[PDB]
Amino acid sequence: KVPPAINQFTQALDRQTATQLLKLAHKYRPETKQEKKQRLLARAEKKAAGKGDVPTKRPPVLRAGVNTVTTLVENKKAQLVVIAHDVDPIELVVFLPALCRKMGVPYCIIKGKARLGRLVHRKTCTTVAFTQVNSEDKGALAKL
Amino acid sequence: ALRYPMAVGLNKGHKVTKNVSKPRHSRRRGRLTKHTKFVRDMIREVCGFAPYERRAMELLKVSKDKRALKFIKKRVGTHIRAKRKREELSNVLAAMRKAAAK
Amino acid sequence: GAYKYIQELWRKKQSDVMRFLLRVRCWQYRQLSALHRAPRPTRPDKARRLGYKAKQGYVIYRIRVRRGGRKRPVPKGATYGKPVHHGVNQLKFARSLQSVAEERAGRHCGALRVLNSYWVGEDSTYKFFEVILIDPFHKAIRRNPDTQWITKPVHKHREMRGLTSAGRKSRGLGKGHKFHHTIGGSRRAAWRRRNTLQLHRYR
Amino acid sequence: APSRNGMVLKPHFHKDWQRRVATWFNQPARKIRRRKARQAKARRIAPRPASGPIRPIVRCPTVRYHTKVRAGRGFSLEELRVAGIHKKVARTIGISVDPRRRNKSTESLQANVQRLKEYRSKLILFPRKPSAPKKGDSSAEELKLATQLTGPVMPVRNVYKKEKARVITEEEKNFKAFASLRMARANARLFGIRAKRAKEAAEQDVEKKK
RNA sequence: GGCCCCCGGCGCGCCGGGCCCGGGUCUUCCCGGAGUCGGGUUGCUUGGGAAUGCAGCCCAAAGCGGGUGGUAAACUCCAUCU
RNA sequence: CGCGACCUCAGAUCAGACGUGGCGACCCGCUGAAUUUAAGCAUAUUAGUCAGCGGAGGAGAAGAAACUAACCAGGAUUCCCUCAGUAACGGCGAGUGAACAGGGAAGAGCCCAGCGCCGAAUCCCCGCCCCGCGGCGGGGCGCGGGACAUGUGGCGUACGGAAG
Ligand SMILES: [Mg+2]
Ligand SMILES: [Mg+2]
Ligand SMILES: [Mg+2]
Ligand SMILES: [Mg+2]
Ligand SMILES: [Mg+2]
Ligand SMILES: [Mg+2]
Ligand SMILES: [Mg+2]
Ligand SMILES: [Mg+2]
Ligand SMILES: [Mg+2]
Ligand SMILES: [Mg+2]
Ligand SMILES: [Mg+2]
Ligand SMILES: [Mg+2]
Ligand SMILES: [Mg+2]
Ligand SMILES: [Mg+2]
Numbered sequence: 083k084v085p086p087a088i089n090q091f092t093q094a095l096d097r098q099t100a101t102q103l104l105k106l107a108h109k110y111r112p113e114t115k116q117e118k119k120q121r122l123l124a125r126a127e128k129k130a131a132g133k134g135d136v137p138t139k140r141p142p143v144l145r146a147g148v149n150t151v152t153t154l155v156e157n158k159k160a161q162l163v164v165i166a167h168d169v170d171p172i173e174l175v176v177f178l179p180a181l182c183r184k185m186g187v188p189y190c191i192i193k194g195k196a197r198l199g200r201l202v203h204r205k206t207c208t209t210v211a212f213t214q215v216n217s218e219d220k221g222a223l224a225k226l
Numbered sequence: 227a228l229r230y231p232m233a234v235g236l237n238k239g240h241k242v243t244k245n246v247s248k249p250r251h252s253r254r255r256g257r258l259t260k261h262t263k264f265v266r267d268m269i270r271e272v273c274g275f276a277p278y279e280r281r282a283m284e285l286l287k288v289s290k291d292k293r294a295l296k297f298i299k300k301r302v303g304t305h306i307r308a309k310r311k312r313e314e315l316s317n318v319l320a321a322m323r324k325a326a327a328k
Numbered sequence: 329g330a331y332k333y334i335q336e337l338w339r340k341k342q343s344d345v346m347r348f349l350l351r352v353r354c355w356q357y358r359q360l361s362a363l364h365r366a367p368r369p370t371r372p373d374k375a376r377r378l379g380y381k382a383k384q385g386y387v388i389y390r391i392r393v394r395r396g397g398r399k400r401p402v403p404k405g406a407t408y409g410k411p412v413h414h415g416v417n418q419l420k421f422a423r424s425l426q427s428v429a430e431e432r433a434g435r436h437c438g439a440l441r442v443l444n445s446y447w448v449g450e451d452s453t454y455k456f457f458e459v460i461l462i463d464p465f466h467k468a469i470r471r472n473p474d475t476q477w478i479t480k481p482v483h484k485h486r487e488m489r490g491l492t493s494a495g496r497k498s499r500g501l502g503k504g505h506k507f508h509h510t511i512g513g514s515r516r517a518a519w520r521r522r523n524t525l526q527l528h529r530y531r
Numbered sequence: 532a533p534s535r536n537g538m539v540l541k542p543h544f545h546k547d548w549q550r551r552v553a554t555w556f557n558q559p560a561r562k563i564r565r566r567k568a569r570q571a572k573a574r575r576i577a578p579r580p581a582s583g584p585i586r587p588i589v590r591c592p593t594v595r596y597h598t599k600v601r602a603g604r605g606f607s608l609e610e611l612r613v614a615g616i617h618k619k620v621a622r623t624i625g626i627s628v629d630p631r632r633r634n635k636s637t638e639s640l641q642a643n644v645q646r647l648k649e650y651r652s653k654l655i656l657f658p659r660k661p662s663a664p665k666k667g668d669s670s671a672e673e674l675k676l677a678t679q680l681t682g683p684v685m686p687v688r689n690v691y692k693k694e695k696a697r698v699i700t701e702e703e704k705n706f707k708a709f710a711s712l713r714m715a716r717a718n719a720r721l722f723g724i725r726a727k728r729a730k731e732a733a734e735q736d737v738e739k740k741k
Numbered sequence: 742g743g744c745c746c747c748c749g750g751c752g753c754g755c756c757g758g759g760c761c762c763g764g765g766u767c768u769u770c771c772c773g774g775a776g777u778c779g780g781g782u783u784g785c786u787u788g789g790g791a792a793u794g795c796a797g798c799c800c801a802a803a804g805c806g807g808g809u810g811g812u813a814a815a816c817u818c819c820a821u822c823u
Numbered sequence: 824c825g826c827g828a829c830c831u832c833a834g835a836u837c838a839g840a841c842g843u844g845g846c847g848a849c850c851c852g853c854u855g856a857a858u859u860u861a862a863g864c865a866u867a868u869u870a871g872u873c874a875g876c877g878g879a880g881g882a883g884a885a886g887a888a889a890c891u892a893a894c895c896a897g898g899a900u901u902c903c904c905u906c907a908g909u910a911a912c913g914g915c916g917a918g919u920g921a922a923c924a925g926g927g928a929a930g931a932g933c934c935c936a937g938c939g940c941c942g943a944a945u946c947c948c949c950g951c952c953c954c955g956c957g958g959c960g961g962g963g964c965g966c967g968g969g970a971c972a973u974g975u976g977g978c979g980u981a982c983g984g985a986a987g
Contacts, residue, residue: 147972235715256806273343303780
C-alpha cells in the first residue's frame, strides 16, 4: 500500500501536455558555459568601448534545483513548478506538491528527471521552476 | 547601624550594583521562528501522526485524559514531555473539531 | 530551503510515508552484500550535515552489521574462573554498532579516510549505516584548505582509534562532573595519572 | 598484625605500584629547558611583553576566596565594547579576550575598563612599515622608550581600603550582632513555611463566613 | 681564536601576478546537527551512592525547547550552558 | 522496433594514484584473567592490570562548555603542587577513592552544515605556449572532456549574522 505522498508521483502529465510544457521550457534554458563566455567577452568589449555597465535586461531563465525552487515557492515567486516523477531518494520532493499547493503556485509532475536534466544541460534535475516570462509566451504559459 | 550586610539570611551577600544587559544569543536557542513553524506544519500534514499519537487521541476523544497521560508518559518517557505532548494532541483534536463545525 | 523540509521529514520515522520508505529500503539493502558502495548518499542532507560535499574524492559505503549483544566466545560457555565472570550471554560490547560499521568500512578501504556515518535503516537482525569516506590523495581534497586536515598522516584510521563521532561516543569523553573518568584525554590517561607514584627528588 | 597502640594504617600499595613510579631526576633539566624556551620566546617577540597579553581583574569564585582578586583568562566583550576596542583588534595589540565571560555587576565591569584604558595609554604601537608611520606612534616615544616588559603586564594586586579610627556612635553600640545573625538564620529557614501557613490561613479567612 | 666549504630563516629598492572596504548608529529581516535526546530494562564500569559512564534491546521527542543544578517524585521560581 | 537520455550495476594487464608489512619505549581503540589479599571463601581485591587483537605520531590523545558553581562568581585542553588518603564506595570487612575552588607551567583560537543572497560565482582531468624544475608550481589559450542544481564556491556560525 503506497501512501498518497509517494503515490502522487505516478500521476504524471500526459504526453501531449508534457510536449507543450517542454517546448515552452526550451525557450528559457540556462545558458551554457560556451555562450556565457561569449556573453562575458562581449560585455568586456562593450565596457572597454564604450557603453559601460549596460545591464541589458538580464533575460528570464528557467530556475532549477530543489533548493532553489523551494525558496521560490516559499516566496511566491514561481509561476509554475515542474517536478520529476522518478527522484530515487524520494524525500527531496515529497513535500513539494503540498508546499506548492499551500503557497498557491501551480505545479505539475512530469515523466523523467533525465528530461529535466537536458533542459539545464546536466544529467538529472529534480525540479525546474518558471519565474516571470517573456510577453510573447505569457499566453502560452497561461494555457499550461 | 540598624542593618548590616550579612553572610546569612534572606538578603545575604555582598552588595554590588547589578549590570543589566541583553541576554547572550546562545540563550535564544530553542525559540520557534515563523519559518520553522511553517516548515513543521508542512511536514505534519504531509506525514500525519505516529500510531501511538493516534491512539492517545482516541483516549482524549472519549475524554480519558488521565489514561491518555499514562499512555503518553509510558511511550515518550517523562512526565514533563508527556504533558507537553498531551496538550498538543488536545490542540489538534480541538482544531479539527472547529474545522468540521463549519 | 529544501534541506530543512527533508530534515523535518526524517524526524517522522513512524509516519505512513516514512514507514513505507524505510521498509522498502531495508528490504533492498538486505538483498545486497554486507559491504557495498553506494552511488550517492541516501540522505544527502544528513550526509552534508556530517561533513560530506558533493565533489570528487567523497565516496559512500553502505555497511550492514548484525544486531544484538556480544556473546563471550568461549568453548561450551565455560569461562573458567570465579562466578562473577561466568557471564556468557547478556553481555554487551563497549562500542556501538555504528562504530563497528565504520571500522568495517575503513578496514576494507584502507586507502580512504572515514569521515562520519549515519543511520539509514534497521531490521530485527541487521542495522544499516552509510559511511562517508574521503580519498586523501585526490587533488580536489588535497588542494582545498579546510579539507587538508584529513590528508595528514595522524588522521589515518580514525575509526580504529575511536576518533570519529560514532567511535568517540564510547570513550566517556566530555566536560564536567559526569565525565571524571577521562580527565587527561582518556580512561587510560586518567588511570595512569591517578595510579602513578610521584617520587620527587626532595620528598 | 597490630602491635600495642598505633594508628590503623591503609597503604595503597596493593596494585603493582612499582611499574608506575615517576622519578624526578629530570626536574633540574626540565627547569633549564623551560627557562631556555622562555628566553627564546622573549627574544622572538622583541619589544612585546615577555609574559604575554594583559589579563583582566577577576574575583575568585567561592566563599573561601571571594575576598581575593586575581588575573582572569581574558577581557569580556562587554568590557571591550565600552572601552571602545574591537574584539578582533584587541588580540593584535596584546589584549586577551574571553568571549564567554559575562559581567554580572558594574563594579567589576568598570574596574576592567580602567585597566584597558590604562593599558591603551601605556601602549607603544609601531607602524607596520617603519619608513611610513601611518597612525601608530611618533618616532620619539618609540626610539628609546620601547622596552620589553618583564613580568605580568600591570600585575593584579589586592588592595585594602584602610579605615581611620572613628568615635563609636550609640546606634553601633546597641546593635545586636549575635541576635541578628540568629534571627536572620531563622527567617531564611522558616520563610517558605511561614508563607504557606499564611496562605492556608487566607484560604480559611475568605470563606469563614457562611 | 683563525682559515676553508656547504645549507637554512630574518629589512631595504625592484620584480610576476594576485589582494578588496572597515567601523559606529538606526531600521528591516534570519537563526541551527533525530532512531538523536530522553525513558524502561539488561550487562559491564565508576568514588558516583533509588543507578557516574558505556553498550545491547524496546519505546521514542520538543522548540519561550533541550541538558545540567551529586537522594527517587510532583508543582514552582532561579541559575547555567546550547 | 530499433535508436537515444538517465538510473543502478559489471569488466579491463585501461590513464594516473593510493593501502598492505615492520618497529612498537611513549600514545589511541577494544578484549581481558587468575595467582594474590580477605589469615577459609563465593561479592570484593588483585584490576580495567598480565596475556590477546587492531591503529598512529614525533609525540599521541584531549580541547575551545548541552562546564564549574551558588560566589561580590569563574571561564578550552594538557601537565605539576594542593585539595586528599578527603567526599564517597565497600561481606561498610579486607580494601578502594575522585572532583571543584586556590597556586603555578603553557597559553590561541577557529571552521562547516543549516537559514539566506550572489546568472555554478566552484572543482578535477587532458592537449598548446611561456617562466621555472629540483619536492613539480605560476600565467595565458582550447565552440577541449568531466564533476556538480540529489548543490560547488564567496559572505556567514550562536561571541549573534545579513541587507539597506
Ligand atoms: Mg571476584
Ligand atoms: Mg535534590
Ligand atoms: Mg593501469
Ligand atoms: Mg600497520
Ligand atoms: Mg585468601
Ligand atoms: Mg593464607
Ligand atoms: Mg598488553
Ligand atoms: Mg592531535
Ligand atoms: Mg580532537
Ligand atoms: Mg561553541
Ligand atoms: Mg591533610
Ligand atoms: Mg578499582
Ligand atoms: Mg604563566
Ligand atoms: Mg552554500
